[PDB]
């Protein structure tokens, strides 16, 4: 089992996809592991907080070369593991394998592209059909995606999250009481958790994505003071500089897919938290491909 998991991990390091029975025994064990985790999963420092990978597997290998190997480096990925990367299946399989093998050395959160409709539209379903012929692996991964924790909390200070805040969410107790074992709705606090963005604005607003909201500095300050938080880490938006502070350094947006869409030319970054929350950003170029 553990030796089999290590063999699967060292196989997936060079982009060899797993088999159907391997996806069976891996996803149905990740279901058991992710069931015990709460919606606000308590991550202990040190951890390296990462942004959207978006299926760019060789960029994920570059990310591992920059920040370190798991389990040596604790990682915290804020969703969007799939959807218009050329190797989304291998990426999500490798990170799920790391979650299963090292349950305390990596925390994987749900993003907005881990819904059934979003993977159906944006090429993860097509990638599963191309790489496996059938369609059971796609719905296996979405059933796993239903089990993923919504948010993460580092030391009770840094509130890691893929999307942004919600008008209907004022406390972390609301997030802990959310029924996360469901498909991502078109509206509601869970959809706002996975889909919202920050903005330079004076309050709430409707997001241009058609799902979630958008919020300004005062909302972020109110949420931080009402919950005893110093920072809200975020990953849902694209940053050309890799990371970007917002709202007087209350919300930081971290993108971890360098050269997003293989066309954007962005230069992604990851956020390393020290033993005493002494943060560090490691910007990295897209990896060479031969």
């Amino acid at each position: 089992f553990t030796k089999e998991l290590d063999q699967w991990i060292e196989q997936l390091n060079e982009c060899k996809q797993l088999s159907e029975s391997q996806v069976k025994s891996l996803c149905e064990k990740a279901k058991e592991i992710l069931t015990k985790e709460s919606n606000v999963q308590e991550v202990r420092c040190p951890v390296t907080v990462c942004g959207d990978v978006h299926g760019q597997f060789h960029d994920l290998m570059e990310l591992f070369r920059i920040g370190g190997k798991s389990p040596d480096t604790n990682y915290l990925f804020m969703g969007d593991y799939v959807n218009r990367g050329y190797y989304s299946v291998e990426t999500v399989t490798l990170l799920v394998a790391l979650k299963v093998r090292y349950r305390e050395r990596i925390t994987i959160l749900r993003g907005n592209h881990e819904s059934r409709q979003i993977t159906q539209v944006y090429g993860f379903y097509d990638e599963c059909l191309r790489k496996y012929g059938n369609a059971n692996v796609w719905k296996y991964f979405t059933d796993l995606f239903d089990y993923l924790p919504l948010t993460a909390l580092v030391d009770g200070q840094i509130f890691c999250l893929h999307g942004g805040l919600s008008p209907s969410i004022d406390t972390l107790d609301h997030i802990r009481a959310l029924d996360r074992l469901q498909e991502v709705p078109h509206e509601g606090p869970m959809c706002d958790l996975l889909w919202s963005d920050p903005d330079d604005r004076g309050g709430w607003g409707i997001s241009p994505r058609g799902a979630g909201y958008t919020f300004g500095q005062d909302i972020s300050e109110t949420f931080n003071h009402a919950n005893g938080l110093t920072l809200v880490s975020r990953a849902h938006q694209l940053v050309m500089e890799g990371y970007n502070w917002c709202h007087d350094r209350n919300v930081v947006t971290i993108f971890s897919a360098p050269n997003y869409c293989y066309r954007c030319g962005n230069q992604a970054a990851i956020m390393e938290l020290d033993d005493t929350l002494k943060y560090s950003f490691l910007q990295f170029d897209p990896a060479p491909r031969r």
Binding site: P46, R65, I66, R103, D274, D275, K278
Partner: protein, 194 residues
Amino acid sequence: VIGIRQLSQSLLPAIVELAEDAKWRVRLAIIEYMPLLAGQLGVEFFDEKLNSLCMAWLVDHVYAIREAATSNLKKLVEKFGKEWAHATIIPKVLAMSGDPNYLHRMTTLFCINVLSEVCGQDITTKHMLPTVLRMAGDPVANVRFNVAKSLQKIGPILDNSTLQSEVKPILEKLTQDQDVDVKYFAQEALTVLS
């Protein structure tokens, strides 16, 4: 095709200049080609020119740079001698042991892993060993299971008289830890060490 004298005259200041490059792959190539320079250069010239960067690569921001520097330390030590290792690298590596940042501690244990095999037996068991036993009480589990893995790796290399005397009690202590991974790597170290 040219020789180390003309290369040291012409290209050495340039490569020293871009060994502090912004892009890490350039620094990785520089680290990978440091054994080439160490092959044809004397120990005194290499000391007065080419070790500030060789030790500063160990505290780099990129894991691949630190790993390449760690693997480069073995190539440097196996050529320039245990005395040069103890004179230059060992204090700088030991400086990373008490460092508050966690990955500098994992870097000094990777230095332990690559330096035990090339520092012999007595130097290993009288310098490298007490630090690894000392840092097994670190509050970060990533340091502790790396202590277990390092004690497994340097076990056959160090002096066998100290093995059951010292390593086994702290391996049992790491086996009685709260984290699952620390227990797993501690029992792996216990089984391989036997």
